Amino acid sequence: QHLTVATLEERPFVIVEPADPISGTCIRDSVPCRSQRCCKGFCIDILKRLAHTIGFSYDLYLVTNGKHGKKIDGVWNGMIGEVFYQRADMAIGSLTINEERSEIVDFSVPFVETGISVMVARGTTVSGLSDRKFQRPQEQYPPLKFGTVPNGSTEKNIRSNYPDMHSYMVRYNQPRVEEALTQLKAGKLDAFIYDAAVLNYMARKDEGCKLVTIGSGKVFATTGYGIALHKGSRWKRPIDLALLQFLGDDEIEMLERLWLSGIC
Numbered sequence: 001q002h003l004t005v006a007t008l009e010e011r012p013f014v015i016v017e018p019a020d021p022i023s024g025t026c027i028r029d030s031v032p033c034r035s036q037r038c039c040k041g042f043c044i045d046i047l048k049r050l051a052h053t054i055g056f057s058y059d060l061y062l063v064t065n066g067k068h069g070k071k072i073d074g075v076w077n078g079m080i081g082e083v084f085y086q087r088a089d090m091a092i093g094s095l096t097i098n099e100e101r102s103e104i105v106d107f108s109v110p111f112v113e114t115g116i117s118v119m120v121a122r123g124t125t126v127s128g129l130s131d132r133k134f135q136r137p138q139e140q141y142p143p144l145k146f147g148t149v150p151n152g153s154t155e156k157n158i159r160s161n162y163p164d165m166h167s168y169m170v171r172y173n174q175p176r177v178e179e180a181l182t183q184l185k186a187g188k189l190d191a192f193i194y195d196a197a198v199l200n201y202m203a204r205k206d207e208g209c210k211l212v213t214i215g216s217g218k219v220f221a222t223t224g225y226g227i228a229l230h231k232g233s234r235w236k237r238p239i240d241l242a243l244l245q246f247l248g249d250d251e252i253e254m255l256e257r258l259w260l261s262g263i264c
């Protein structure tokens, strides 16, 4: 009846703000979340609906041990680690389903479609991730500068499928999306390769609409965000049924409009 839920800030899917200074409570659509503050956003609204529909209470906390999830020398960190090591009953956020993670935790059915996209300044001109500027990176006279934020499903995918390109990207690793966008707009990066759902949102919200996304096309695989649960969790089925209901009730579509819209 009571679940411990791990999450991670990644706007606009999870947004963290201080409590209302006047009341000292989380107001509006926000809910209390502690650190491993008030949380809101697309995924938090999903969590609120799951809790109401299925009928559980929860304790929400922000992950400080890494981010989404990476395995290093046999040990998982991030949201995936919290679930795998059974510190949390579930993790919800902008958490990407991939093969490696699916082996060790169960995922809900996907509730947001994602993958990998490439962001560049509208001025800049490359074809896409197929472009040899990316693929044969150290062939270009002034090298192309492209990076990702390391440790997530994007870097995992690139290292596994395009190890040459990955090796070239390492020096351009960015600490978070905000800095990457800054470097891209300053021309310190030529492209930023990252989660599609997030990148496409950032493109839509860009002050002045100067940042644009290119589809990765055939280069990378589509996937989705899923809620992570203990392998064999009894919670998977009721979570899935609820999510499926939300999808067909246009509740998810409504939340997309609410949280992920932009003018660009």
Ligand SMILES: N[C@H](CCC(=O)O)C(=O)O
Residues within 6 Å of the ligand: 068, 069, 094, 095, 096, 097, 148, 149, 150, 151, 152, 153, 154, 155, 193, 194, 195
């Ligand atoms: N959703 C993030 C992907 C971030 C990225 O593009 O690396 C994850 O679960 O790892």
